[PDB]
Symmetry: C4
Subunit: 480 residues, 4 copies
């Protein structure tokens, strides 16, 4: 049991689409409609009527009409008090809550509503200046999207923990899509490409420095005044510098976002991979000054990861990022599934073969390798000669080949085909979301105290305030 009816029937009325109670509570001498007071849980009716939504057509029309009517009534009953600005216990506005919960219909309303009545046109979002046949030039005077100073809308959407059912669908709406596209086109694109080029130089320097490590053992290695040593040690210093930089940026990301440790591996994939690179790099430098030879064994892993992480920058090239996301999705969702099956078969037949033949392929490891080799097309079928029960041996090997090489790999290919069909359209939206989070971090860091990235301007766009004062809302024009 339990609901928000208690001490607040308006919430239940709006949930129930029974607007008569809502209009009845307005100004009754028995008891007026106190929409403006917050409930015990901290939220308001404007948040409750957001909770009802489920994005379906009938629910969309119900909740949209209910919200618009309730908002107009709030405006006319209490012109001295705004309702959309009142935050809940956590801090979310109805805009913020609808975004966080992934209520695409209510979002579509909140960023596109319009008024054709006097003394309340401050509630409209869309405004028109030029009106031609094929095309119109409308304007959005949205705030609380670029920098709301509590939680910007894009911060709420981009950093959701993948639990929002419309995690990446809502960003396709025009009032956000055009903003992201413009932010990309104006200044973010140059910063991002510059970062890409800087990283590529970083990996080239790291590869060159590592490849020319001095071959004698027992580090550290005394430097000579010759030029090769200045180049090498400079390359090393640049390499470790890059590593520690990534370490700090990774930890800053984690402390700011703090995902749930189950989302940590199914989101924030890129940050953990970069962080792990930096961890290997720092373990390497630690072992390097520790007078151990083993540091190279760590360095290469960073190197091996470093080049691979270059795929992170394929976001920013849609035609290629749409490919690059496939590896993330398959390595996360499909590799564990396949690898358990494959390791079961490999271990089963490998133990059978290795226990069968005993008196050079007498280890379990060597035979695990030899039966792995049938998956890369180098099995030989005669890796042992003059051994007992050879008929049984060959039956086992051919059973293995038929099982894994002929069937299981082909099952893998077919399943990847089906999954690729099932994510034909999803990957594009994932790419757009990846561009969005790229843009957000780009704006957040900004590298040089430069913040001149506002919308089309703070002009007196509306001029119909309920007070006699003037509006300033950083408006933004769209040629529809």
């Amino acid at each position: 049991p339990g609901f928000y009816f208690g001490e607040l029937p308006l919430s239940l009325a709006a949930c129930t689409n029974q607007l008569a109670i809502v209009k009845f509570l307005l100004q009754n001498s028995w008891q007026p409609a106190d929409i403006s007071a917050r409930d015990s849980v901290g939220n308001t009716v404007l948040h409750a009527l957001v909770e009802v939504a489920d994005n379906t057509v009938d629910n969309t029309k119900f909740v949209t009409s209910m919200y618009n009517e309730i908002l107009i009534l709030g405006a006319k009953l209490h012109p001295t008090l705004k309702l959309e600005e009142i935050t809940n216990r956590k801090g979310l506005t109805p805009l913020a809550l609808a975004a966080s919960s992934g209520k695409i219909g209510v979002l579509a309303y909140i960023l596109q509503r319009e008024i054709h009545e006097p003394e309340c046109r401050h509630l409209s979002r869309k405004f028109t200046e030029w009106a031609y046949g094929p095309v119109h030039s409308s304007l959005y005077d949205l705030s609380c999207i670029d920098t709301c100073e509590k939680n910007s809308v894009l911060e709420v959407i981009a950093y959701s923990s993948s639990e929002t059912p419309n995690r990446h669908d809502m960003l396709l709406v025009e009032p956000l899509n055009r903003l992201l596209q413009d932010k990309w086109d104006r200044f973010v694109k140059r910063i991002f490409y510059f970062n890409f080029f800087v990283y590529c130089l970083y990996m080239i320097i790291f590869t060159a420095a590592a490849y020319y490590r001095p071959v004698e053992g027992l580090p550290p290695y005394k430097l000579k005044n010759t030029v090769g040593d200045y180049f090498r040690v400079t390359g090393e210093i640049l390499s470790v510098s890059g590593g520690v930089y990534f370490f700090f940026r990774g930890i800053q990301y984690f402390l700011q976002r703090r995902p749930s440790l189950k989302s940590l591996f199914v989101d924030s994939y890129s940050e953990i991979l970069f962080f792990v690179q930096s961890l290997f790099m720092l373990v390497s430098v630690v072992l390097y000054f520790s007078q151990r030879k083993e540091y190279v064994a760590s360095m290469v892993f960073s190197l091996a990861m470093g080049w691979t992480n270059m795929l992170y920058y394929t976001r920013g090239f849609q035609q290629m990022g749409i490919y690059a996301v496939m590896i993330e999705k398959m390595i996360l969702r499909d590799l564990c599934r396949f690898m358990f099956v494959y390791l079961v078969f490999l271990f089963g037949f490998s133990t059978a073969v290795v226990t069968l033949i005993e008196d050079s392929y007498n280890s379990l490891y060597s035979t695990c390798l030899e039966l792995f080799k049938f998956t890369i097309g180098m099995g030989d079928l005669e890796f042992t000669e003059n051994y007992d029960f050879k008929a049984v041996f060959i039956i086992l090997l051919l059973a293995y080949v038929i099982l894994t090489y002929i069937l299981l790999l082909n099952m893998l290919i077919a399943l990847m085909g089906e999954t690729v069909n099932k994510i034909a359209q999803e990957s594009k939206n994932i790419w757009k979301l990846q561009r969005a989070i790229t843009i957000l971090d780009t704006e957040k860091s900004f590298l040089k105290c430069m913040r001149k990235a506002f919308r089309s301007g703070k002009l007196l766009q509306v001029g119909f305030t309920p007070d006699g004062k003037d509006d300033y809302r950083w408006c933004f024009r769209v040629d529809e």
Copy 2:
């Protein structure tokens, strides 16, 4: 010739959906309706009502309406006796018959009917306790589902011999789905995982014991007081103990179910595989004490099967269970086809090549192998030098390679693509059924004389019987 009209026109009325005869026969002074007496073949009219169904929309409405009307009239005319409780020649109730024959519409009715009338409301199934806007709390008086003591519904569905057209679709209805989900969530899950862990330890012990068999010939091998021999012989005793355990459980499964020996290989797949493992294990121990060297040959097959059978426990993880099911389907129904085609090609070209070249690759076996190799990417195209008719030889080999390696394997990949596409959604229902049968065996065995797994309780929820007595039905709540 012949029909079911004889001495029962009500079956014809249902076949034509002519309801007037029902009410006409109801209480006619010439002869009333004797609903309560059984037919000559043992069954009742309500069973005939079940047989007529075909799960389609119009047939569903016709059969549902006629069934409900007949039930109400049976209540009104003969309140002293129940009709659903009367069994047929085999023992099935209309519930049980509808389940066994796969009559999903009538099943959906029987467990979801409702009454809004006095003195017959005991016939209602669904009941309501709380009624909110978005959610309602309903209640079912499900009985004769968990343990009806003649034919439980789950017993009938789970153990159908795969001939029921809706074999796995019946379990999707709420009154069964929620029961299975709760039984899984409550206590079955821990028992199943415990079994899984126990089996994994079993296979580890078996592998370790077998790998370290003593290398000298002529078993049995005299034990030393050193610790290695105590460990090895203990491992052997545990291994053969597990084998005989599986033997007994397999034979118990067969005697309790007794499938039809055509269903035996397309259902009961897991049981026969475990049974075959145990047979190899027991043959191994028989040969072991028989002073035979070749017990190894029977050991390893069990070992090789043992690890493979671990995929049985992949039911229990849906995201992996469907994958293991796909492998089962491909090995069962698709392999025989391809293997016949492939063996025809391999044998044709192998016997042609071996008869061509004669004066080391002169056996049919060696050449069968050499041409098999072209599938796994290790054919050489020059495995013979200085032999007659080399042009003809090479034409044959290239014809073979073009035929099988280039085309037939690609035909296999494409066909697996179509089949995987065609069973993407069926496998989910197969997994759910494979969990249902697991749950049923879990309840049946219960390991420790613990049976406290009943539904929400036998409280006097309804109490609206035409007699003054009370209801005790092991209720069950659903948060709709």
Copy 3:
């Protein structure tokens, strides 16, 4: 030029769906309708009504209704003579013309007529004997199907030259489907399986005889009285006997059907393959007695073909026959398409590599082979050492490998996938047609002067002729 207005307005009326002209021309005192007289090209109006059909819904209803009306009127005006039995210049009845042209709508009508009037219901096809609610037991008096003694319907459909747009679709209609199914179930199945077993013994004997050919040269080989020679020569005699038998079978097929030499390779596939086997076998006999050693070079090509032709008998096992059909389709229509491209690439890069490197891989043949090997996963990339322009060499080889191994073969796999998707349903109908042809030849040959394979009997089922005589039509009962 040329049209249907000339001296036959009835065909034009049919083209225009205007029955008024038909009834007016029917029995006018100025001139009645001479429907029964044949046109100058040999055909009648009933054949014209077939020509106008195009299998669409509206065309179906138009042609069906107008045909029925015209036929009833022809019966009423001229009860002394039948109209459907009058043949055209070639010999086809309207049933035969509709079948040969592939007019599925008219075919469905003509075999399923029904009349509820006296003195004309002799023209109906379907008759009812038992009438229950869900099932009825009807009968067809259909003749001119099994043996019409001029051109049976099944002969017309089965032996069409693949130009019929509904070549295999029309056999799904019940009056033919049930006939074929019963003919299969009754006696054909045993003959077919017997043939299959006989052929399998034939190939086993041939393989054994060929494998043990005497190894010395210069045939023929003098026989010894020892048992091995009696077995070998008996096997040889059986082998050649089988070859010549197939030779006669193939030539009889060609002379009876006489396809068009463009249909010859896209239909009659199985017959030409068996014929080619027999040709190689007879060539081997000729060379054998010609004191040539190279007879073996022909014998193996029979042997290699012989085993492969066993796939012909997969018709008769639907689940496997469909798969063999898919292989036939691919090897016919996709292999030329692919192999042109592949041979172009192989020849281009092979001649480039061979002209590049000159001073053991210096022949065009050896290099054609070496670059072929990259398809089967055995290319080495260093098959030449110490040769000029090695950079150019390696660029060419890697260009080749990237082109064919990585891209072309994967593209072949993808296109086979799409084609397989596009023929999922066609192949089933091809299988049914193949079984139909099997049945027809089985009935035609009949092996022992046994022809007791008629339909349900010539009983006087209808007996409502406009004359006082009785009906004898070899009826056939169907329990619908």
Copy 4:
């Protein structure tokens, strides 16, 4: 700001679909509608009403109806001058603009428009001569298709820079499709096949000449009077002649068309490939007379390209052209995506392995090769023995193999599958366009001052001029 209201509201009526304004402006005594005068940008209202089109159903009907009305009014008010003939600043007619911009609806109308009114029927396109029930014989009097003397519509469609949304759909309309089919059937097909055969002889001669280059160094090589040298030098002269011919033809293509240097690789693929062949050929002859041995390194590339370019002639065989075009698409669109990913992985693990193991495989090149080999199924997993950190080495190699061989290549196969499915239909229209461009170039060149390839003739089929004169328009008959 800015809009085309100024001094021409007729275009605004057209884009607003308000016939009142255009009818009122038509012939008002205050001011008529001066349709015939060009606007400031050079175009007329007939072009404006094309500009607003968007090929949708409603837009199609609006623009079609209004265009027809405007033309009729032009006929009635201004019979002294035609309006469709007035060209814009560039020179396009309304049909030319509709085609160039890809306006399939208006393009379909404007070539098919018909009038059932006297004194203006001269403006119709379609005319009917024979009228049968199932068939009709219509005629098109279209001009400005074969030779417009400014720009034919086929030149407009064929040479669009791939940016037109209906690039290849416009050729599906009857007056163009039938015309192209007939042009192909009449005389073009023999010319094309003759060209194909000539080219095949050219490549055979080139291959033979190059293969038999004299093996001694230091070209040029003194000729002997023996026949082999006359054959070789003649082959060389023919080869270089072919090369220079292609050079001139390619540069003529570029200068006539002059694409945009971004479409230069998106279209004109075939021409640039042939041109590149000729460039390699000319570099080869330059180096040949330059007394350099390196000329062979250029020769082979031409040879290697030469054979490959034979796929250009696979247009002309539709059943194979659809395959060659898909190869072109994959090499252009999919190779860059995959090759970046693959090269990143190959380079990352190659540099990791090569820096790990140092003391023969110490080069980055050799290891880059060795890890490339794992794609073609010849990796060994033990290409180094007795090296430090072998556990780390093997972990890296197996990580590489699992990453690329097992996953990346299979994902490539699946992605090619989805892409080829998404272009199942587009390849057909691409082939038809590729034949259209062939036909147009064939007519342009014509090889021998032969131009007798007009339409069905200048018959006086219309004869409904507002003057008393006759129509001569090179008509063309279509038997619908």
